[PDB]
Coordinates of C-alpha atoms (C1' of nucleotides) and ligand atoms in Angstrom, one line a residue:
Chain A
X2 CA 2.7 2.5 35.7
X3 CA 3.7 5.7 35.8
X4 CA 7.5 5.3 33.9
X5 CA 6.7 5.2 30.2
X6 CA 8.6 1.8 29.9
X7 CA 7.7 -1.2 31.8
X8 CA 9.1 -4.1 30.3
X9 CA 9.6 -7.8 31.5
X10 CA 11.9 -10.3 29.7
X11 CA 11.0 -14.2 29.3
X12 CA 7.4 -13.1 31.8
X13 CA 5.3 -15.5 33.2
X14 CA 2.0 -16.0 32.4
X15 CA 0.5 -14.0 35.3
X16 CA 3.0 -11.1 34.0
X17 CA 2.1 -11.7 30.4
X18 CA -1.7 -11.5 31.3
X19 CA -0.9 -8.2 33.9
X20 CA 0.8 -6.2 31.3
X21 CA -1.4 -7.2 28.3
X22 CA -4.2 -5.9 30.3
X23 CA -2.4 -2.6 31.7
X24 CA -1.8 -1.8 27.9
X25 CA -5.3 -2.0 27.2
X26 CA -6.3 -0.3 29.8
X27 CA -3.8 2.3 30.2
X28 CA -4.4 2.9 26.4
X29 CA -0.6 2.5 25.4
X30 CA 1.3 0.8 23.0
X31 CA 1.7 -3.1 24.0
X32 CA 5.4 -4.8 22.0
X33 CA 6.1 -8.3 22.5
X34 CA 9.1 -10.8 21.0
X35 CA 7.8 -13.8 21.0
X36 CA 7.2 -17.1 19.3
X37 CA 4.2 -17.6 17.5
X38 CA 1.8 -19.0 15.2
X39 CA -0.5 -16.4 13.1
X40 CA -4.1 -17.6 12.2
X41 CA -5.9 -15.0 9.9
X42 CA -9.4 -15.4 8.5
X43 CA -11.3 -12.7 7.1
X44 CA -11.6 -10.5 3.9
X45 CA -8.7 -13.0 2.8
X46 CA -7.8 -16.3 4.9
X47 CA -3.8 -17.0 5.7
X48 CA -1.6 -19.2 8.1
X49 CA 1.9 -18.9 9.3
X50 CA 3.9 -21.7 10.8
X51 CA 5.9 -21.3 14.3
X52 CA 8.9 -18.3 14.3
X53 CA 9.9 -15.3 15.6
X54 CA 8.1 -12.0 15.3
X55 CA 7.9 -8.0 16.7
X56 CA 3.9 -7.9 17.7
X57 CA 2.8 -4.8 18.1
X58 CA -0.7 -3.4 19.5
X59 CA -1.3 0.1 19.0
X60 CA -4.0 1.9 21.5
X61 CA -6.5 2.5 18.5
X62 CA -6.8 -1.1 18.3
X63 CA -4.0 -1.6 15.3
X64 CA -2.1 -4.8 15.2
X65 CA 1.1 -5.5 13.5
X66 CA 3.1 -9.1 13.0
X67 CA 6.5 -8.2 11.7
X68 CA 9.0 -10.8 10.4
X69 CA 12.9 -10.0 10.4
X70 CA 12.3 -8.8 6.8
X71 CA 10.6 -6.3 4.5
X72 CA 8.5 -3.4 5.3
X73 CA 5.2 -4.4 5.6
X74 CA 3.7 -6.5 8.6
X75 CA 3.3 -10.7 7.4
X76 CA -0.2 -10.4 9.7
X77 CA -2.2 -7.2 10.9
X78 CA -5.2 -5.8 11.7
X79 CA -6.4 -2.3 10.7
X80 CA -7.5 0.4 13.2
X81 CA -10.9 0.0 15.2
X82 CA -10.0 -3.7 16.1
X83 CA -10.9 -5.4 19.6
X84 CA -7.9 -7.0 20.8
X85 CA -8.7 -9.5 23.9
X86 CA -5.8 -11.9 25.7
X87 CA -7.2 -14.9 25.6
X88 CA -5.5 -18.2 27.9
X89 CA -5.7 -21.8 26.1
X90 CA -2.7 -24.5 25.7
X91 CA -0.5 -21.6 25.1
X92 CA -2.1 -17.7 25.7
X93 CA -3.8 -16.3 22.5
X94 CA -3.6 -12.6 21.1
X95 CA -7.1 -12.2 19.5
X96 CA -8.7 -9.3 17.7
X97 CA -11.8 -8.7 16.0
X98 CA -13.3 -6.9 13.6
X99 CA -16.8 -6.7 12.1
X100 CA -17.0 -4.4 9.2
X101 CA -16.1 -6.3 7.2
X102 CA -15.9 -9.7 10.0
X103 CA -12.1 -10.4 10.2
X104 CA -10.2 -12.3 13.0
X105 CA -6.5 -12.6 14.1
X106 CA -5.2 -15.0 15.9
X107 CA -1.7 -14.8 17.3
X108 CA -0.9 -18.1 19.5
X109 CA 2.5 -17.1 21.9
X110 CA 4.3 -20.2 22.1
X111 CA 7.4 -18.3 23.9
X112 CA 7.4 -14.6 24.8
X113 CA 10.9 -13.4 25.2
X114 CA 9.5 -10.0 26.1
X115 CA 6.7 -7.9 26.7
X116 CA 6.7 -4.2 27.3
X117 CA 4.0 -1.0 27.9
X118 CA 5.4 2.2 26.3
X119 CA 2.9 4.7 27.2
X120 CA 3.9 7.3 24.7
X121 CA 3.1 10.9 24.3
X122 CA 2.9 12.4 20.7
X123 CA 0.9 15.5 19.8
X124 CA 2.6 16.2 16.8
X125 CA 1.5 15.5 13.0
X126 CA 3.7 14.8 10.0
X127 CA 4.2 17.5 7.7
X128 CA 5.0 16.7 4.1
X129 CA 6.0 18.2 0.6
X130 CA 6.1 16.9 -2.6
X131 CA 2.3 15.5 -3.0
X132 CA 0.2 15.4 -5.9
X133 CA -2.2 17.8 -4.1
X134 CA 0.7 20.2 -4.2
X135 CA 1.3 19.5 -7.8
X136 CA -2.1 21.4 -7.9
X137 CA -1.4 24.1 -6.1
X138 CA 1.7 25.2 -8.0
X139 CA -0.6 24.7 -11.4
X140 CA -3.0 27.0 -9.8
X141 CA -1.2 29.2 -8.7
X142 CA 1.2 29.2 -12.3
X143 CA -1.0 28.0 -14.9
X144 CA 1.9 28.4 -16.9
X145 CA 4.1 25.3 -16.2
X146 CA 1.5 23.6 -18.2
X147 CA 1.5 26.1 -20.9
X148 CA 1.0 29.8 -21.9
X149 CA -3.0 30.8 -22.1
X150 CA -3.8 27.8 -20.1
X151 CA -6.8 28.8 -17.2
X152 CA -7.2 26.5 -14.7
X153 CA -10.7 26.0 -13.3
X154 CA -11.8 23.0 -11.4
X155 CA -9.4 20.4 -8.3
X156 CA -11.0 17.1 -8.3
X157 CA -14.1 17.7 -10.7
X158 CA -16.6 14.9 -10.6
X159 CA -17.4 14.1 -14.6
X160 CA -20.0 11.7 -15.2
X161 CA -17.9 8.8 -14.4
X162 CA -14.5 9.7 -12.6
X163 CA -13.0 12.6 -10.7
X164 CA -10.9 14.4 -12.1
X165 CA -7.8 15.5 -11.4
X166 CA -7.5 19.3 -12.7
X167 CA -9.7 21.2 -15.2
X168 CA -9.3 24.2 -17.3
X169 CA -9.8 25.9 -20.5
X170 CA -6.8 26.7 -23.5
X171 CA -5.9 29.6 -24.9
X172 CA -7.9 28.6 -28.0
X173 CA -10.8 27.9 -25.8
X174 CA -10.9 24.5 -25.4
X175 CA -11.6 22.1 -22.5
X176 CA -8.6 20.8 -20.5
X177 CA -8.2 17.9 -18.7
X178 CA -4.8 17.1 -16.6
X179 CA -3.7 13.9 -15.2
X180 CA -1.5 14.4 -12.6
X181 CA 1.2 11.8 -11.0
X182 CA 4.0 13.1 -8.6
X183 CA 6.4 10.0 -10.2
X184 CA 7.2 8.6 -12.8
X185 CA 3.5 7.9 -14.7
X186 CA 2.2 4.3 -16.1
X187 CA 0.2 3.3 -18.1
X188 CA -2.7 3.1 -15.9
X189 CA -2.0 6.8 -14.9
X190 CA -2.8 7.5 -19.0
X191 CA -6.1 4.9 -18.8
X192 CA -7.3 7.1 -16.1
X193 CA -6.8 10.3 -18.2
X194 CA -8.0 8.9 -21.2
X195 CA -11.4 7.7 -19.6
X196 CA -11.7 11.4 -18.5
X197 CA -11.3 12.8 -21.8
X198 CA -13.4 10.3 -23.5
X199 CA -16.5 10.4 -21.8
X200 CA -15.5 14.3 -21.9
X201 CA -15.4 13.9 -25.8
X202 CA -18.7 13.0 -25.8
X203 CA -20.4 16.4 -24.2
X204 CA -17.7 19.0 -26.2
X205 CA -16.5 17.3 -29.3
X206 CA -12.8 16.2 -30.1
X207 CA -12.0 19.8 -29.2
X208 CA -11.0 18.6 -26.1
X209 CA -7.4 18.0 -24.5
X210 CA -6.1 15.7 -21.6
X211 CA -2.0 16.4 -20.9
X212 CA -0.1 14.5 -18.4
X213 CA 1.7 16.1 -15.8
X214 CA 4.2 13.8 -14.3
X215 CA 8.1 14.2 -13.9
X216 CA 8.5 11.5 -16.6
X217 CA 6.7 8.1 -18.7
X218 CA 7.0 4.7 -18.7
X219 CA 7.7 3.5 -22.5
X220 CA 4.3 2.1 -22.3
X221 CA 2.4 5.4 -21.2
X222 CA 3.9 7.4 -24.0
X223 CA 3.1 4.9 -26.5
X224 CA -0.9 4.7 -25.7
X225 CA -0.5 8.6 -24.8
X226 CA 0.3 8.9 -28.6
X227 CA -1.5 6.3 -30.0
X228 CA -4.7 8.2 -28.4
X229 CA -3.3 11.5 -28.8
X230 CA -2.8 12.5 -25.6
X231 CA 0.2 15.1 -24.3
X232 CA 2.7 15.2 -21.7
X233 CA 4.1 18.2 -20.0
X234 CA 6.9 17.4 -17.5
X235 CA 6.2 18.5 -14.0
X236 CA 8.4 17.8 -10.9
X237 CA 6.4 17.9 -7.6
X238 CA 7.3 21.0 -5.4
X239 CA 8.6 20.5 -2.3
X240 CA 8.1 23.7 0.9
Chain B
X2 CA 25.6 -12.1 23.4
X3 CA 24.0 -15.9 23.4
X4 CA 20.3 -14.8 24.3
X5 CA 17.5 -13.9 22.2
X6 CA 16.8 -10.5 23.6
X7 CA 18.6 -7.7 25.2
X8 CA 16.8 -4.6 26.8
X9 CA 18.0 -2.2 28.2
X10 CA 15.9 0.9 29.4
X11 CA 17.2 4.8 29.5
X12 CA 20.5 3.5 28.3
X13 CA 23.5 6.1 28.4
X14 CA 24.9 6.9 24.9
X15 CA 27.9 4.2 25.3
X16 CA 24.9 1.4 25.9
X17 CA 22.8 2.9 23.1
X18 CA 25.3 2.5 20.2
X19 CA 26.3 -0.9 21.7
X20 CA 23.3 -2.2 21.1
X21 CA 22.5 -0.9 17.6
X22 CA 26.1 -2.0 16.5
X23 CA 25.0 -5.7 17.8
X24 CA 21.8 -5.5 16.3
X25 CA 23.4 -4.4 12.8
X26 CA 26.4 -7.1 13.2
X27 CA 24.4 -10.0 14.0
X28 CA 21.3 -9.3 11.9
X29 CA 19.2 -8.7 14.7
X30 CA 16.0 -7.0 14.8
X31 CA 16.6 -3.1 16.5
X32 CA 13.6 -1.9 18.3
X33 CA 14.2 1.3 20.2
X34 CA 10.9 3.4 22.2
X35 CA 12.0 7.0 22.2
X36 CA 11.0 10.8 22.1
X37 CA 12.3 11.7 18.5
X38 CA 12.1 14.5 15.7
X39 CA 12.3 12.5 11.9
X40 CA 14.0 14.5 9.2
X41 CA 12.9 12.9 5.7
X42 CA 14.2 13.6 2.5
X43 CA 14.0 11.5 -0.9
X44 CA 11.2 10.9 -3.4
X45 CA 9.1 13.4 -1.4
X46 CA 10.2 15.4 2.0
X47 CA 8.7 15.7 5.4
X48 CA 9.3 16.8 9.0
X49 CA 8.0 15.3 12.2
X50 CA 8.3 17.5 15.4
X51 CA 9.3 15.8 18.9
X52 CA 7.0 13.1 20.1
X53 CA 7.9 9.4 22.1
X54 CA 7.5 6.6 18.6
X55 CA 8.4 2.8 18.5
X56 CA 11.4 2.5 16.5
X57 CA 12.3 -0.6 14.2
X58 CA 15.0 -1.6 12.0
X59 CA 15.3 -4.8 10.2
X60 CA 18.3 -6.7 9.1
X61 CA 17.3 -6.4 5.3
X62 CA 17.7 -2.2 5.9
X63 CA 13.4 -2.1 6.7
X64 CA 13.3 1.3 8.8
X65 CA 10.0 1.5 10.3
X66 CA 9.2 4.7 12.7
X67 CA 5.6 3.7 14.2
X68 CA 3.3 6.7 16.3
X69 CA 0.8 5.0 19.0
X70 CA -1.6 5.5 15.9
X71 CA -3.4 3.8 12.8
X72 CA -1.5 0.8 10.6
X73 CA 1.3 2.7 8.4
X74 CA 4.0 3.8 9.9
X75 CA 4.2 7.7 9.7
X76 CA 8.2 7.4 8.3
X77 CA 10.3 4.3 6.6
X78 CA 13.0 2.8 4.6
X79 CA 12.3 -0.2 2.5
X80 CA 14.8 -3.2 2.7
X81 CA 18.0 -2.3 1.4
X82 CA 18.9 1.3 3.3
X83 CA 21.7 1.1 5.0
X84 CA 21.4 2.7 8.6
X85 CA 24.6 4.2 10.9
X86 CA 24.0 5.6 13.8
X87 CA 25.6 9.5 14.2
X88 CA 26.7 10.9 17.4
X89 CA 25.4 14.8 17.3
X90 CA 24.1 16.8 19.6
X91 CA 21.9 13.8 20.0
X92 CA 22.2 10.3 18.2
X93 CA 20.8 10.1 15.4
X94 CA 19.4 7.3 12.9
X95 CA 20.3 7.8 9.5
X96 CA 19.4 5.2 7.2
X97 CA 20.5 6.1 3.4
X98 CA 19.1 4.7 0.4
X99 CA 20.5 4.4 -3.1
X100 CA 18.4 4.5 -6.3
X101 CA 16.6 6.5 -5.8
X102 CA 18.2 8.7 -3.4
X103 CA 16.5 9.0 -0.1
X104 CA 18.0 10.3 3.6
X105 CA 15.7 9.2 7.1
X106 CA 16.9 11.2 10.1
X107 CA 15.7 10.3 13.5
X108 CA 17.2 12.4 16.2
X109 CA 16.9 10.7 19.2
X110 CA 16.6 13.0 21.8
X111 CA 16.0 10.3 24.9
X112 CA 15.9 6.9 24.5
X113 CA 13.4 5.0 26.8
X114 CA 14.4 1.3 25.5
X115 CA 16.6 -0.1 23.0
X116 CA 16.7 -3.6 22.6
X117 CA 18.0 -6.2 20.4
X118 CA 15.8 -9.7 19.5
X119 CA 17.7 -12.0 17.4
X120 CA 14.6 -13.2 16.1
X121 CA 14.8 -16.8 14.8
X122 CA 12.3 -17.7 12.1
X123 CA 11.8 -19.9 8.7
X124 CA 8.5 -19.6 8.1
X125 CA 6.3 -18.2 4.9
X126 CA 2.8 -16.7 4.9
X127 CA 0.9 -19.4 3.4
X128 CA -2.3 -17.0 2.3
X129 CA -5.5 -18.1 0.4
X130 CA -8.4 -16.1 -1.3
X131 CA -6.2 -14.6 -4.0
X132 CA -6.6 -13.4 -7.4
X133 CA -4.2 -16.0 -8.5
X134 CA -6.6 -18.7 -6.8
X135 CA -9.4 -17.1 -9.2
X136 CA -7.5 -17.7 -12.0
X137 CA -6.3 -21.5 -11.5
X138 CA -9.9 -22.0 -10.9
X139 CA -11.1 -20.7 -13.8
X140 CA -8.5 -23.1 -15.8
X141 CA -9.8 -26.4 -13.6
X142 CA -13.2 -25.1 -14.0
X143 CA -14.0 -23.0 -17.5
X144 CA -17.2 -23.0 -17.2
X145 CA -18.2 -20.9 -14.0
X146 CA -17.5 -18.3 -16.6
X147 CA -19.6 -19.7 -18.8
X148 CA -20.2 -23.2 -21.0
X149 CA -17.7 -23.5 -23.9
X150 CA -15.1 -21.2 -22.8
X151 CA -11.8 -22.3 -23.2
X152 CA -9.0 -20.4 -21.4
X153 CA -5.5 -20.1 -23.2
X154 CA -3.3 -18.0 -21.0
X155 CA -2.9 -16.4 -17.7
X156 CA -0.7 -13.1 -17.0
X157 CA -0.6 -12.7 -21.0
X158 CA 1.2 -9.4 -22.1
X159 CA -0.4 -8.1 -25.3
X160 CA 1.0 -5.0 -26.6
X161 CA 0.2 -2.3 -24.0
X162 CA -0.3 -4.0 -20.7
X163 CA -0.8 -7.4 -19.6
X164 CA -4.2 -9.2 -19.5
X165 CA -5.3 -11.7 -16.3
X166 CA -6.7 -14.3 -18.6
X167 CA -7.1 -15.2 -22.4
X168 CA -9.2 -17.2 -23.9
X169 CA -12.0 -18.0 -26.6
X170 CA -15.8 -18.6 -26.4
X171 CA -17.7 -21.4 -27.8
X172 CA -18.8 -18.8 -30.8
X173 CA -15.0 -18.3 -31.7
X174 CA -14.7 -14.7 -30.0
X175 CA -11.6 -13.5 -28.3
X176 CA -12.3 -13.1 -24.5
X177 CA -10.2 -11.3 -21.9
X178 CA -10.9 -11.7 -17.8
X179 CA -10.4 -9.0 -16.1
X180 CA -10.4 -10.3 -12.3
X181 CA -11.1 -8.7 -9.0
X182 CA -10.8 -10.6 -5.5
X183 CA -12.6 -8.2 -4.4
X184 CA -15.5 -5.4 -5.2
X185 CA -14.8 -4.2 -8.7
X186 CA -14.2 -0.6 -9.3
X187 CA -14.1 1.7 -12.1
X188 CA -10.1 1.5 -12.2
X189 CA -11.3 -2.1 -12.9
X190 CA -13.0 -1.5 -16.3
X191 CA -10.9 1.1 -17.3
X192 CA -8.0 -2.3 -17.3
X193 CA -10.9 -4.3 -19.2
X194 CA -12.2 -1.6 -21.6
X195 CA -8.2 -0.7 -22.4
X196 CA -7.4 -4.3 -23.3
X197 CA -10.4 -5.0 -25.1
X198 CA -9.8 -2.0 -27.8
X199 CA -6.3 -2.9 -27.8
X200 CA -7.5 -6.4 -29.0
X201 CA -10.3 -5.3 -31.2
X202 CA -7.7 -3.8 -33.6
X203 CA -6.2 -7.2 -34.2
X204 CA -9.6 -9.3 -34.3
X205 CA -11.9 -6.3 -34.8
X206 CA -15.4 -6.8 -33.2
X207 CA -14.8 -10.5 -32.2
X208 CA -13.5 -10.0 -29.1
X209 CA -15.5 -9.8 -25.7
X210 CA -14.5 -8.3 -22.1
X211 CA -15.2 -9.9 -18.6
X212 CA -14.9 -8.4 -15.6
X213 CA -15.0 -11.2 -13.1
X214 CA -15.5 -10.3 -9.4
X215 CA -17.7 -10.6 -6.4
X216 CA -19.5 -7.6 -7.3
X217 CA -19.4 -4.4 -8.6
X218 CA -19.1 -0.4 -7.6
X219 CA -22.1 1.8 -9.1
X220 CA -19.2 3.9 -11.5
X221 CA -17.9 0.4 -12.2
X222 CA -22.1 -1.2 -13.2
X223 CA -22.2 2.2 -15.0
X224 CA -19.2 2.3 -16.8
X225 CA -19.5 -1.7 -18.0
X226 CA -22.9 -1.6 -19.3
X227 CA -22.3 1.9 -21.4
X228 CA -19.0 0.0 -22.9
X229 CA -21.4 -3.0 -23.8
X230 CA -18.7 -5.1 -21.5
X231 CA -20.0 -8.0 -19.0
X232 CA -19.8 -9.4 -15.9
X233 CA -19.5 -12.6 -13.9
X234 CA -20.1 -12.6 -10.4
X235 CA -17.4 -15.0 -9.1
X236 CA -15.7 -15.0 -5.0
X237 CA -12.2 -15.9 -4.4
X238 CA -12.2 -19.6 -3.6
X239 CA -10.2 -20.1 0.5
X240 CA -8.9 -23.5 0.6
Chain C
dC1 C1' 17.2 -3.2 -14.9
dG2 C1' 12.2 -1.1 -16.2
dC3 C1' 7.2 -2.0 -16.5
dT4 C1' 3.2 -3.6 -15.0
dA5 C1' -0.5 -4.9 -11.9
dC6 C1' -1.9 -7.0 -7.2
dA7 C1' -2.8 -5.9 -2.3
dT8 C1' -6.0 -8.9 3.8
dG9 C1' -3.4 -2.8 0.4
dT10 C1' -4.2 1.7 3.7
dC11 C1' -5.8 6.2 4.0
dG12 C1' -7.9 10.6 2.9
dT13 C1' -12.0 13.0 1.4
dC14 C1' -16.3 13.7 -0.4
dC15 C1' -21.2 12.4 -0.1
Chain D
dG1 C1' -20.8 3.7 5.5
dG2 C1' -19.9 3.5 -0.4
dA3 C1' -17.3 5.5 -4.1
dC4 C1' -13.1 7.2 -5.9
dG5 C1' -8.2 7.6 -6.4
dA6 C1' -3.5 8.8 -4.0
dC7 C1' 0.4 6.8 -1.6
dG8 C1' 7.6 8.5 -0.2
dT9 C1' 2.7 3.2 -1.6
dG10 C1' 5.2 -2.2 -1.0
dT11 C1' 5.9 -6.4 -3.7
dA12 C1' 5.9 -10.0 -7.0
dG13 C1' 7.1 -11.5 -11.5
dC14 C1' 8.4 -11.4 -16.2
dG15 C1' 10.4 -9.2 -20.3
Ligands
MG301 MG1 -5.9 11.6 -10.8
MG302 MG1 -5.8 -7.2 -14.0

DNA sequence: CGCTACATGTCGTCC
DNA sequence: GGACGACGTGTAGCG
């Protein structure tokens, strides 16, 4: 319990239940192989039928149920859950959460391993390429939008909506800009349209919205035209 | 090779790309605890600085790098990268993907456990509570939208975007659904409002919105009643 | 394929 | 905690 890996293969119950605990306790992250049936009720209510899964219990109370495909977990819980072992007709991995009330429910039928990995990370990821950088580069060069454009407000609250940027033209106007870091859709132009609607209604059909995405769908340039919307291609930065 | 699980802790270099060269082979699941810097570099770009992670790859190309904290993991691949193992300086976890173009470096600079789990399982999440559940509802049961309404389609593209369900009142107005399994937001209406013009300019004012959900944001409340569109307060049904 | 919209979305960030 | 919208979103499902 000092060695960040302790790790059993095909452990007994007393094992299961002593290392289960020490994970808990220890506050480190507890992985399992193991067969299992997943019992989820909750915002939504699921079951899945007896097979193989990675089970993993993060120390901030985050489950994961991972199947031999795709990239999201079949069965989870989100952070802030209370995970309990629990011993029945086969041992039980329970958690609990109350806001909003859900329960998972992961019945080992065979654990081919269980292991403790008391790991040690201080770092935090850094990354490039965001929306919220998109900003940045607008602020800082109004121009990639256009000549004469001033931006003013990040993330103005309107009446109904928040806005992504919002400036003024070069023939005075009010600007708004939807931004996307990909490829835009069409709800990327609903969102911008809403804005410059409600918008319309303080300043007149003086005012602008512009999308600023690297490219369109063929569905958000034709109701960006058909509403008289514009476009200005934008890639995100990346540092 | 004939067992479900092989674990080997601190492996040297020879045992380390043993074992991932299994895994790959026989479409194993790849699970590796180690202290690791993550190069990333593809639709956006990040670094992560040396810190112990659980590792995972999946035989569909899922790359899955997991700190002891909340649900996401802090770098993937989705299934279909395609993941080698280099020998460097250290050995490092590459994982390229094609369309678009994305690279995931992990540099594993010591490798606490790598194991293999040949992870048997046939099983599907059987889920219930869905928006899809709402919808066959409302075609068993019309009228917990309201008496007289006849539902026509479900998933129904008109010409920009594609409504939940289509149907007529007992006046011989147009109505779309808009459906929520859960609390309905402004992003919501904005879907609603957007199909409903789109239909008034075929059937003019004879067409009426619906947003159907358990209940409703303030924007959302706000935003409905100022377009004159309605709601019906309806909960996923769990079988 | 490209586009669209759901999701037990999750997560940040303001209030 | 509710509201609001981003995310390297993933993922289905249909043209
Ligand atoms: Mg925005
Ligand atoms: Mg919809």
């Amino acid at each position: 319990s000092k060695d960040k890996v302790t790790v059993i293969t095909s452990p007994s119950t007393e094992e299961l239940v002593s290392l289960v605990n020490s994970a808990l306790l220890e506050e480190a992250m507890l992985t399992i192989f193991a067969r299992c049936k997943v019992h989820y009720d909750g915002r939504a209510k699921s079951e899945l039928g007896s097979g193989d899964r990675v089970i993993i219990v993060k120390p901030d109370g985050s489950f994961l149920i991972h199947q031999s495909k795709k990239r999201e977990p079949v069965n989870w819980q989100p952070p802030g859950s209370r995970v309990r072992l629990e011993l029945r007709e086969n041992p039980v991995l329970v958690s609990i959460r109350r806001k909003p009330r859900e329960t998972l429910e992961v019945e080992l039928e065979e654990v081919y391993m269980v292991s403790v990995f008391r790991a040690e990370d201080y770092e935090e990821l850094a990354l490039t390429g965001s929306e919220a950088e998109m900003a940045e580069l607008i602020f800082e060069n109004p121009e990639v939008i256009e000549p004469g454009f001033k931006p003013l407000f990040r993330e103005k609250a309107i009446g109904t909506g928040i806005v992504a940027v919002l400036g003024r033209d070069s023939d005075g106007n009010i600007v708004v800009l939807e931004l996307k870091r990909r490829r835009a859709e069409l709800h990327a132009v609903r969102q911008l349209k809403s804005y410059v609607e409600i918008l319309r209604e303080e300043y007149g059909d003086k005012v602008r919205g512009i999308l600023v995405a690297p490219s369109l769908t063929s569905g958000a340039k034709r109701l960006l035209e058909k509403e008289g919307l514009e476009f200005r291609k934008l890639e995100p930065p990346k540092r």
